[PDB]
């Protein structure tokens, strides 16, 4: 049986932070659903790459549970995630059921919006720190990837491989992460 | 005036190797055209990410010249590039006019197919070396990014940031590459 990932794709998502996790997770044999927040229409990412989701979020949320819920960054994508009642519900259920939640760059600020994982040690993009830390509900880290229990965070486009491989390790183990990593030609 | 890039997107392209250069180049203020080899329909990449091109290659090739032509990798994407007469023409014109050609992973094997840049020092994905070296028409390198004149090559998903930043440096200079790099949170 394979593990399953839900990647929530909103307008303004950082496309590198979307595609790197999707691709790496699929290399790991994870069943990944790219779910469009706004429906199954194509999504215009932050740098104008247009990605066709696998499903609407509306549909995908009925086909859970997922072993991980992934929140890409990009300032405007994260804002859309933060404003969504559907995202709130998905994250609250995931946290209740002790499933992994993984967010990168500005993505963790949706955790704040939805009151998820308070008390966790987290990282974000440097420019998103102040937003994440408003109210002091998290403890900040400058590590490239941070994991505190079921809350997995990371910093930016350039940490996306490390983030994705951390998700793979959490779901499928160290050996699978190492096997997936080698063909990537990472430093 | 801005520099212009043509990114040729075929079925089976490695989506990370497509999106990272597009996004990084747009961050650099380059005007990037994502051109679908087979037309302007959505393209199913190697790990099933579906990208909507900006234009068909047929249309985009009429709107040149481009300061760089970029060939993503992915074994099957590169095969499609290698089999295309339109790609052959584009690359031969680009080489004739002394414009940059940038190829990553399996992508450089399309240079071999189209008889482009013979004698150049090149790199590829490790698994693509034998194909690239058939006939001894290039000199092989294990550097993460290799540049020999107007032939710029790189190795894999994990070298895509370095590849993209090398394109930015070649087109817009070292200072712009450094400015674009810093917000990425690269090591």
Tell me the resolution in Å: 1.1
B161 and B16 Cβ atoms separated by less than 8 Å: no
Pairing of strands A50-52, A43-44: antiparallel
Q: What are phi and psi of A18, to 5 degrees?
A: -90, -55
Q: How far apart are CA A8 and CA B184, in angstroms?
A: 21
Contact residues, chain A, for B157 at CB < 8 Å:
20, 23, 161, 184-186
- Nearest to residue B65, comparing CAs of B18, B3, B115, B1? B3
Length, in residues, of chain A: 187
Structural domain for B114, as ranges: 1-187
- Report the number of distinct structural domains present in chain B: 1
Question: Do A26 and B42 lie within an 8 Å CB cutoff?
Answer: no
Q: Describe the crossing of helices B160-172 and B15-27 by its angle, rounded to 10 degrees.
A: 30
Residues 6+ apart with CB under 8 A from B146: B121, B122, B123, B152, B153, B154
B5 and B29 Cβ atoms separated by less than 8 Å: no
Nearest to A47 among B23, B48, B187 (CB): B23
Q: How far apart are CA B163 and CA B12, in angstroms?
A: 20
B34 and B65 Cβ atoms separated by less than 8 Å: no
Nearest to A16 among B14, B19, B125 (CB): B19
Query: Can you give the CATH number for the domain in which A130 is found?
Result: 3.40.50.880
**Closest chain B residue to the Cα of A181, Cα to Cα:** B158
Locate A126 and state its tokens: 């440097």
Q: How many CA atoms lie within 13 A of B26 on its CB side?
A: 17
A45, A105, A114, A137: the active-site residue: A105
B59 and B28 Cβ atoms separated by less than 8 Å: no
Locate A118 and state its tokens: 């308070």
Query: CA-CA distances (angstroms) from residue B168 to A101, A137, B27, B173?
Result: 34, 39, 9, 7
Which H/E stretch holds residue B9? strand B4-9
Contact residues, chain B, for A184 at CB < 8 Å:
156-158
A148 and A97 Cβ atoms separated by less than 8 Å: no
- DSSP three-state, residue A114: coil
Q: Give the distance from residue B57's alpha carbon to the nearest chain A alpha carbon, in angstroms.
A: 16
Residues 6+ apart with CB under 8 A from A60: A6, A33, A35, A54
Question: Do A19 and B15 lie within an 8 Å CB cutoff?
Answer: yes
**Closest chain B residue to the Cα of A35, Cα to Cα:** B49
Q: How far apart are CA A88 and CA A112, in angstroms?
A: 10
- Neighbour count for residue B125 (Cβ, 10 Å): 28
Locate B110 and state its tokens: 């399309």
Q: Where are the beta strands (DSSP E) in B42-156?
A: 43-44, 50-52, 55-56, 68-71, 100-104, 121-122, 139-140, 145-148, 151-154
Contact residues, chain A, for B52 at CB < 8 Å:
42, 50-52
Q: How far apart are CA B143 and CA A179, in angstroms?
A: 22
Which H/E stretch holds residue B31? strand B31-36
- Nearest to residue B147, comparing CAs of B97, B108, B114? B108
Residue B136, classified by CB atoms within 10 Å of its CB into exposed (0-12), middle (13-18) or buried (19+), is exposed
- Nearest to residue B70, comparing CAs of B105, B120, B46, B122? B105
Residue B157, classified by CB atoms within 10 Å of its CB into exposed (0-12), middle (13-18) or buried (19+), is buried
Known catalytic residues of B are 105, 125
Q: What are phi and psi of A9, to 5 degrees?
A: -110, 115
Q: How far apart are CA A110 and CA A126, in angstroms?
A: 16
Q: How far apart are CA B28 and CA A23, in angstroms?
A: 25
Locate A107 and state its tokens: 């993505």
- Sign for the CA dihedral angle at B72, B74, B78, B80 comes to negative
Length, in residues, of chain B: 187
The dihedral formed by the CA atoms of A19, A23, A24 and A27, expressed in degrees to the nearest 10: 180
Q: How far apart are CA A91 and CA A98, in angstroms?
A: 10
Contact residues, chain A, for B50 at CB < 8 Å:
51-52
Pairing of strands B139-140, B121-122: parallel
Question: Do B51 and A48 lie within an 8 Å CB cutoff?
Answer: no
């Amino acid at each position: 049986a394979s593990k399953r990932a839900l990647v929530i794709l909103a307008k303004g998502a950082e496309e590198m932070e979307t595609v790197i996790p999707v691709d790496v997770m699929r290399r790991a044999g994870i069943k990944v659903t790219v779910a469009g927040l706004a429906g199954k229409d194509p999504v215009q990412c932050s740098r104008d790459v247009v990605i066709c989701p696998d499903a609407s979020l509306e549909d995908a949320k009925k086909e859970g549970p997922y072993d991980v819920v992934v929140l890409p960054g990009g300032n405007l994508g994260a804002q859309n995630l933060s404003e969504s009642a559907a995202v709130k519900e998905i994250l609250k259920e995931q946290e209740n059921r002790k499933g992994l939640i993984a967010a990168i760059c500005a993505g963790p600020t949706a955790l704040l919006a939805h009151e998820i994982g308070f008390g966790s040690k987290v990282t974000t993009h440097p420019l998103a720190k102040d937003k994440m830390m408003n109210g002091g509900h998290y403890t900040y880290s400058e590590n490239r990837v941070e994991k505190d229990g079921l809350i997995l965070t990371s910093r930016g486009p350039g940490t996306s491989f490390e983030f994705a491989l951390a998700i793979v390790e959490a779901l499928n183990g160290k050996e699978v992460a190492a096997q997936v990593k080698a063909p990537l030609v990472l430093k």
